Amino acid sequence: TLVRPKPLLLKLLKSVGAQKDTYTMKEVLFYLGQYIMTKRLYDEKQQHIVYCSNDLLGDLFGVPSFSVKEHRKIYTMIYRNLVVVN
């Protein structure tokens, strides 16, 4: 699945090293993981929960926190922020 991230998502991807405009969904998830971990956004004692109200990720996703157990919810938040091209 090939996607074109919208400006805020693109900015977050590039902030962890990405240098292009079109990505696979695998790449988008990879870079978002790198972003979450470098920014230390997951709770050290409840590690499936991401806290993002003090981060651009929270602006992107429109939530102050989320769980990585919630796959459908996360896909929705990501898809809102890109255009799928195939």
């Binding site: 993981g33 997951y42 590690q47 157990k69």
Partner: peptide
């Protein structure tokens, strides 16, 4: 993107 026990396990080797 399949082990959801923790953010590092969800991303490791993915």
């Amino acid at each position: 993107f399949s082990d959801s026990s923790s953010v590092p396990n969800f991303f490791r080797n993915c």
